[PDB]
Amino acid sequence: KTTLTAFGFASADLIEIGLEGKGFEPTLEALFGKQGFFPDSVNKALYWVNGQVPDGVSKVLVDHFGYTKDDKHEQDMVNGIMLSVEKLIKDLKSKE
C-alpha cells in the first residue's frame, strides 16, 4: 500500500494491491524439496542429455535441486521425465 498526504492534515492512500493466498506451503514442498518434480527433472536432464553447464551454474543446480553422477537405472530421458510428471501429478492431486 502507498499513501499521500499533501492536502494539509488529510490522509489519502494512493493505491493498495492485496495478494492473498493460502495452501502454497504444501505446493512449494511438493514442487521444490526432496521428492519434487523440478529436482528430479533437472537430475534426469543432467544425467541423460549431454552438455554440462559451467561450474558456476552446476554448483547452484546441485545446491538447489541436486545432481546425481552415477545411476543404476537405464530408463532414458523419456522415462525420467514421465516418472517426474507422474509424481508431480500425484503431488498435486493429493492435498488441499
CA distance 50 to 62: 17
Q: Resolution limit in angstroms? A: 9.0
CA distance 28 to 38: 11
CA distance 36 to 20: 24
Phi then psi for residue 54, to 5 deg, are: -60, 165
- CA 10 vs. chain centroid, Å, equals 45
Report the candidate in 18, 19, 37 with the shortest Cα–Cα distance to residue 27: 37
Which residue blocks in 1-96 are alpha helix, DSSP H?
24-31, 37-48, 55-64, 76-92
Distances (CA, A) of 32 to 23, 24, 58, 80: 15, 12, 17, 17
Cell of 5: 498526504
Cell of 68: 546425481
